[PDB]
Design a protein around this ligand. Structure first.
Ligand code: HEM
Ligand SMILES: CCCCCC/C=C\CCCCCCCC(=O)O
Length: 455
């Protein structure tokens, strides 16, 4: 048969929408998953999506023959400032492919290699920021993670120096960028968008959207007036030609990929670093195993692309951190054509599936009776993991492009951190995940005793 689809409390016209009225809608969703199963329908006025929690359905939607990346309502609100950079453009849309072809070359094994030196530059500034601290003082973890991640993509990707550690308040781009994500996320719970009480908010949006674009204007500016032969993301953006179309990328699009890269390729990573340092601190053995591994690979003052390549264990910490709290928490798909999802559910073409990744990772029939446990080891043999079971980086062609960049910077700095530093959970931090589309622990702070080792 057709089963009728499960689906939570409705409120007349408001449908399900009053359910999502919260700061933590993805958490609220996980909860409703938990209550409802492996697939439920969420309907709001105008839209309708099905959330998918279960590996069985997921792998079925992960099939490119049947389901293309769809722009979820979130994305569409991100799309007002990201237009059609890779993140927030349809698959069937000239600029997507173009920018893939044009822009991928910047993520290949050799590029990783040149990027390395400049990662280190950063990860050093950090280590040093933490080494210059006095007794009384703690580190505000996800704040400083964010200082790292952003300066890194800046220099790696664009050879601009945000100079985040030269500053004690978060960076103007960070601030207007956060308020933009927060906007996109509230616009999702709005009964009535055109209400006059949201006028102060639309103004605030344009204000921050500008700040962001300003910084691109500074970035492109200073690439003009430069002794370059940079081989980064920007030179490719600005000068590659899509071998499929012979064409290069329009100014308008370039300026969307700049914004895209400066957001998506730093926020998700610092999220990880912080969930990572979280579970470490809450699990003092795991910390120790990985802090030792580390002592004995990073034998050099300053690490090296291959040195990072051996942090076997610390890449395992990271996968797990990402397994528990996937910091880009969902992707979206439409039905390419009418189908039936696991033999039970009739989809019309156009239908919006939507993958709760943090629930996908908690499918107990895949991972064991103990999903909520932070066990890096479950990542001893990559082999054992069924396909479509650990998708923290999306699916098929529509997949994190920055992936191996990300793991590489996390693995890098995590590792250096693990090596110069004793980390004391001084306040018994209880985990608070802040949502702004992506996820990041909030108010997570720690103390760091050095092992006075220079660099
Ligand atoms: C752990 C940190 C990261 C996580 C969890 C992550 C996760 C993701 C996810 C889930 C998607 C797909 C979203 C969707 O399919 O709708 C994605 C796509 C994308 N990501 Fe990441 N990512 C990370 C780091 C990065 C890095 C560092 C960059 C670049 C420097 C980056 C750039 C991109 C781009 C351009 C896309 C769009 C490509 C496309 O779909 O055509 N991400 N990433
Ligand atoms: C290009 C800018 C980067 C993208 C930033 C967003 C990262 C992941 C998107 C998360 C979508 C999660 C949806 C949350 C609530 C819902 O689906 O209703």
């Amino acid at each position: 048969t057709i089963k009728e689809m499960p689906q939570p409390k409705t409120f007349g016209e408001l449908k399900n929408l009053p359910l999502l009225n919260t700061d933590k809608p993805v958490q609220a969703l996980m909860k409703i998953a938990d209550e409802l199963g492996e697939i439920f329908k969420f309907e709001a006025p105008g839209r309708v999506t099905r959330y998918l929690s279960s590996q069985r359905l997921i792998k079925e939607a992960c099939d490119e023959s049947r389901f293309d990346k769809n722009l979820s309502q979130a994305l569409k609100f991100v799309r007002d400032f990201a237009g059609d950079g890779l993140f927030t453009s349809w698959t069937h849309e000239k600029n997507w492919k173009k920018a893939h072809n044009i822009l991928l070359p910047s993520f290949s094994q050799q590029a990783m290699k040149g990027y390395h030196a400049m990662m280190v530059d950063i990860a050093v500034q950090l280590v040093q920021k933490w080494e210059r601290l006095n007794a009384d003082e703690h580190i505000e973890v996800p704040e400083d993670m964010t200082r790292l991640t952003l300066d890194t993509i800046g220099l790696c990707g664009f050879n601009y120096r945000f100079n985040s550690f030269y500053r004690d308040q978060p960076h103007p781009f960070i601030t207007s960028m956060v308020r933009a994500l927060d906007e996109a996320m509230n616009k999702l719970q709005r009964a009535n968008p055109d209400d006059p009480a949201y006028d102060e908010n639309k103004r605030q949006f344009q204000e921050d959207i500008k700040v962001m674009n300003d910084l691109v204007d500074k970035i492109i500016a200073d690439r003009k007036a430069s002794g370059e032969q940079s081989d980064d993301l920007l030179t490719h953006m600005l000068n590659g030609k899509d071998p499929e179309t012979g064409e290069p990328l329009d100014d308008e699009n370039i300026r969307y990929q700049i914004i895209t890269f400066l957001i998506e390729g730093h926020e998700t990573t610092s999220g990880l670093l912080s969930f990572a340092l979280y579970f470490l601190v809450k699990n003092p053995h795991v910390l120790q195993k990985a802090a030792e591994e580390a002592a004995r690979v990073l034998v050099d003052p300053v690490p090296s692309y291959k040195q990072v390549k051996q942090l076997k264990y610390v890449g395992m910490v990271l996968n797990e951190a990402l397994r528990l709290w996937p910091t880009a928490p969902a992707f979206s798909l439409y039905a390419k054509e009418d189908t039936v999802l696991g033999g039970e559910y009739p989809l019309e073409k156009g239908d919006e599936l939507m993958v709760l990744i943090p629930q996908l990772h908690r499918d107990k029939t895949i991972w064991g009776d103990d999903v909520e446990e932070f066990r890096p080891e479950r990542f001893e043999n990559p082999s054992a993991i069924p396909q479509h079971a650990f998708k923290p980086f999306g699916n098929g062609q529509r997949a994190c492009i920055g992936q191996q960049f990300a793991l590489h910077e996390a693995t890098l700095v995590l590792g250096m951190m693990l090596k110069h530093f004793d980390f004391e959970d001084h306040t018994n931090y209880e985990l608070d995940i802040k949502e702004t589309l992506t996820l990041k622990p909030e108010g997570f702070v720690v103390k760091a005793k050095s092992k006075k080792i220079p660099l």
